[PDB]
Amino acid sequence: AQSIVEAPQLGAAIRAGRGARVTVSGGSLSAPHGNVIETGGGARRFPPPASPLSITLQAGARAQGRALLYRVLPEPVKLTLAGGAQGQGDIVATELPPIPGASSGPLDVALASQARWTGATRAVDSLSIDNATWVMTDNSNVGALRLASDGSVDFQQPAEAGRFKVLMVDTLAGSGLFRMNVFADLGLSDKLVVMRDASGQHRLWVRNSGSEPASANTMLLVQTPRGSAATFTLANKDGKVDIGTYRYRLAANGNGQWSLVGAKAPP
Amino acid sequence: AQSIVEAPQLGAAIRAGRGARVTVSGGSLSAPHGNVIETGGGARRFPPPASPLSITLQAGARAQGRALLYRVLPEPVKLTLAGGAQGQGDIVATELPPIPGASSGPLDVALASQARWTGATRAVDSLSIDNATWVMTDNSNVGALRLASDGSVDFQQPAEAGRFKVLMVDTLAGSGLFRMNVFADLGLSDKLVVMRDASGQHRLWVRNSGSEPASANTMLLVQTPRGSAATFTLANKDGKVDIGTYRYRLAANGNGQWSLVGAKAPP
Amino acid sequence: IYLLGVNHLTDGTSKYNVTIADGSASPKKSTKFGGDGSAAYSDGAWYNFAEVMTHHGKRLPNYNEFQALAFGTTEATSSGGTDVPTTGVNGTGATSAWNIFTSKWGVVQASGCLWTWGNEFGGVNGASEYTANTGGRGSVYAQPAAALFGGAWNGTSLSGSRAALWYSGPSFSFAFFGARGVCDHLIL
Amino acid sequence: TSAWNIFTSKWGVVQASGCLWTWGNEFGGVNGASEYTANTGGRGSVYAQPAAALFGGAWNGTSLSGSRAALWYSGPSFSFAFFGARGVCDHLIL
Ligand SMILES: [Mg+2]
Numbered sequence: 001a002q003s004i005v006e007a008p009q010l011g012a013a014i015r016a017g018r019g020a021r022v023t024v025s026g027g028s029l030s031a032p033h034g035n036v037i038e039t040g041g042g043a044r045r046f047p048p049p050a051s052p053l054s055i056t057l058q059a060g061a062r063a064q065g066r067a068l069l070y071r072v073l074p075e076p077v078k079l080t081l082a083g084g085a086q087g088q089g090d091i092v093a094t095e096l097p098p099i100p101g102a103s104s105g106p107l108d109v110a111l112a113s114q115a116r117w118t119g120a121t122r123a124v125d126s127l128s129i130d131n132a133t134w135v136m137t138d139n140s141n142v143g144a145l146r147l148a149s150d151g152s153v154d155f156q157q158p159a160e161a162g163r164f165k166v167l168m169v170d171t172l173a174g175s176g177l178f179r180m181n182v183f184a185d186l187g188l189s190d191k192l193v194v195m196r197d198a199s200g201q202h203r204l205w206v207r208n209s210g211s212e213p214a215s216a217n218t219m220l221l222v223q224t225p226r227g228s229a230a231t232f233t234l235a236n237k238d239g240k241v242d243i244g245t246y247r248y249r250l251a252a253n254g255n256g257q258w259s260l261v262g263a264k265a266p267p
Numbered sequence: 268a269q270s271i272v273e274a275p276q277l278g279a280a281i282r283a284g285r286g287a288r289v290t291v292s293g294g295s296l297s298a299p300h301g302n303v304i305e306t307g308g309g310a311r312r313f314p315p316p317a318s319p320l321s322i323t324l325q326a327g328a329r330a331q332g333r334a335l336l337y338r339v340l341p342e343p344v345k346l347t348l349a350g351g352a353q354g355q356g357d358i359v360a361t362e363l364p365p366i367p368g369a370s371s372g373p374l375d376v377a378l379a380s381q382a383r384w385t386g387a388t389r390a391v392d393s394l395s396i397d398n399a400t401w402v403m404t405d406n407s408n409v410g411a412l413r414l415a416s417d418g419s420v421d422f423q424q425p426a427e428a429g430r431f432k433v434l435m436v437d438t439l440a441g442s443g444l445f446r447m448n449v450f451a452d453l454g455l456s457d458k459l460v461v462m463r464d465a466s467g468q469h470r471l472w473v474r475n476s477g478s479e480p481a482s483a484n485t486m487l488l489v490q491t492p493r494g495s496a497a498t499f500t501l502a503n504k505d506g507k508v509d510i511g512t513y514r515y516r517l518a519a520n521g522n523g524q525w526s527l528v529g530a531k532a533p534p
Numbered sequence: 535i536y537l538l539g540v541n542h543l544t545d546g547t548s549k550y551n552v553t554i555a556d557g558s559a560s561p562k563k564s565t566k567f568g569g570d571g572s573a574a575y576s577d578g579a580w581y582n583f584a585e586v587m588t589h590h591g592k593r594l595p596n597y598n599e600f601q602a603l604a605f606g607t608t609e610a611t612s613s614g615g616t617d618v619p620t621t622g623v624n625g626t627g628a629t630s631a632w633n634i635f636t637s638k639w640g641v642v643q644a645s646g647c648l649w650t651w652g653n654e655f656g657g658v659n660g661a662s663e664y665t666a667n668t669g670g671r672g673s674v675y676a677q678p679a680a681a682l683f684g685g686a687w688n689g690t691s692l693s694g695s696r697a698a699l700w701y702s703g704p705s706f707s708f709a710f711f712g713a714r715g716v717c718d719h720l721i722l
Numbered sequence: 723t724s725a726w727n728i729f730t731s732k733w734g735v736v737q738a739s740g741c742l743w744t745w746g747n748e749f750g751g752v753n754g755a756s757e758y759t760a761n762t763g764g765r766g767s768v769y770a771q772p773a774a775a776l777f778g779g780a781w782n783g784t785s786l787s788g789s790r791a792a793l794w795y796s797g798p799s800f801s802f803a804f805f806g807a808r809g810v811c812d813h814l815i816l
């Protein structure tokens with residue numbers, strides 16, 4: 001509670017395992033070169049779900065490091081950023097399980113009540129953003145993404161002109177916002193792929209990050225399964241975005257593929 | 268047969284529609300700024316699958332243009348490159364169908380006996396390479412992919428270093444080879460993503476395209492569903508690739524995710 | 535005010551809260567044209583909706599009529615969902631409410647709920663050769679498309695007071711195709 | 723080059739032809755793109771949109787102008803300094 005923890009290159013600021021319960025309310029945890037949180041390394045296997053080790057950063061907690069969370073990869077984890085907590089890290093895992101085959105518990109993270117994770121991941125099993133924000137800094141994988149009460153994923157604007165990012169998700173559900181970058185006469189954009197199942201009302205805000213276009217060309221923003229039940233709407237003022245002498249609107253057709261059409265702007 | 272056909276920017280070398288049957292053997296078709304082949308524009312709608320308009324480029328045919336095939340939407344097409352024919356274009360559809368919520372048939376291409384399409388697509392419903400090669404020139408989308416008898420999908424080597432390409436597929440079947448680009452110093456690589464269903468024995472051949480890595484670092488190569496039935500094997504001889512003073516091998520980890528691991532090369 | 539009902543024979547063409555006629559729930563066969571009074575047409579072809587409007591001394595809108603009647607609706611928006619089966623109510627899984635699509639003049643579901651067939655021809659022609667597709671009442675040749683206006687529940691950005699599709703032949707039938715009646719204004 | 727009254731009709735229609743094209747109320751002729759296009763001043767999109775007829779000819783029209791001069795080219799979205807309009811309506815006998 002309102003404490004400071006500084007870790008050097010080799011280590012981590014917090015290691016929890018064997019079913020621990022950590023809360024960090026307020027204060028700061030830095031780990032410049034290493035991890036902010038590490039999980040496992042001293043195994044104790046159990047058939048029913050014990051206290052699937054949970055870490056909670058709340059009430060204004062600041063956390064910075066190369067990775068925000070580093071999973072060993074025997075144990076299931078449960079990271080939670082709440083109450084305006086802010087962590088810039090990465091969330092990585094071991095990338096080969098110790099026993100090839102038969103399961104491996106979930107790595108679950110909840111972003112809630114005004115919190116803000118800013119990083120990249122291809123390791124999280126299930127993310128739930130709820131009136132909070134994930135600033136996505138690089139291409140990412142997530143199993144099950146859920147949004148609620150104005151939760152957003154905010155594709156971070158590249159300082160590298162022209163370079164787009166892709167967020168792949170296995171299942172989408174609920175209702176949230178997705179701020180996405182678009183590059184006009186290069187005709188490229190941040191994409192969002194849902195692979196098995198999509199549902200709910202979502203919104204897409206569009207940032208003009210590549211300067212205005214020579215022509216009028218469409219841009220794929222969202223790809224979803226064939227007979228999908230999910231809906232998306234352009235969140236910019238009036239359901240349109242003006243890029244130079246052009247105007248764009250979100251239109252989807254056929255098979256949950258939500259492009260962004262545009263043609264000459266009203267004189 | 269052995270004919271030559273040139274077309275201006277505003278046009279196409281061939282337009283076929285309403286159950287047309289076109290065969291091009293030998294010869295040449297160019298459309299420097301237009302389409303080589305256009306499909307549709309003159310509606311005739313019948314529920315029985317008559318002679319779904321088909322084009323065949325065979326016996327060493329040459330074909331060049333801004334797109335190899337432009338589909339007018341809401342007629343089904345069957346493009347076939349065989350007998351060592353070579354076409355470079357792009358294959359595009361209209362994005363929006365004329366009637367939002369109705370049946371549209373498929374855009375099916377079949378690369379066979381020694382043929383070679385070089386281009387990119389997000390319009391092809393069902394591509395089947397068989398003892399042929401698709402040189403993929405940019406990010407792409409295909410519904411059902413199917414390979415056989417040394418059918419390959421050669422990811423083209425980028426001129427821009429660091430620029431990786433991604434192929435997304437709904438379903439994968441049969442047995443083929445994938446040439447892929449690797450940028451070891453950056454820890455980045457071409458990716459193949461299968462979203463609904465994968466199966467069969469496939470081979471990956473790695474090309475070094477960003478030499479001298481600081482450390483040994485894993486690079487994701489293939490993504491497949493749940494517990495997919497698909498096997499992949501690294502086709503570089505001895506099942507390894509030596510990038511500077513480092514050796515990489517392919518390992519499948521957890522839920523069908525084939526990464527390229529590697530560490531310091533044996534002395 | 536409302537899109538054509540299936541029971542137009544007993545309700546009139548324009549009634550609140552009734553099943554909307556489409557390719558599936560096709561309108562009752564006009565009694566003025568050999569309809570028995572409970573039988574429905576076998577599809578939702580232009581011919582059929584045009585027949586029904588005549589029977590009530592009305593016609594399908596022209597472009598200039600449509601762009602006018604539907605002004606005031608929310609432009610470039612659609613009902614969403616998988617269906618709009620009923621007049622004046624929200625659609626099956628509607629992502630926005632019916633009254634968002636209400637004209638300056640109180641035309642209910644003006645746009646983006648169901649395409650209305652029009653009374654203008656042009657756009658994409660059919661086979662340049664005789665085709666007997668007219669419910670067995672003769673043959674067409676180079677038959678141009680019969681206009682469709684407004685957009686339906688599933689063309690999100692495409693829909694609106696000027697939305698227009700000139701592709702469908704008059705013999706086409708789909709569940710996104712209904713009709714809205716118009717007629718002259720007489721002052722005496 | 724020729725004075726305005728040259729273009730008065732039998733019915734007293736002034737500048738009846740050969741001055742400005744008039745938009746007509748009839749669709750047909752050259753189609754626009756076979757793909758939805760949002761060129762309606764932001765009131766929806768149009769697929770395969772046929773031209774709105776224009777009648778009469780204009781000052782530049784040379785010997786093509788006249789009572790049956792008709793151009794089926796311009797889509798409803800087009801706009802030029804020689805495209806105008808003339809109103810017509812029904813005749814009411816009570
Ligand atoms: Mg007319």
Ligand SMILES: [Mg+2]
Pocket residue numbers: 654655656748749750
């Ligand atoms: Mg007409």
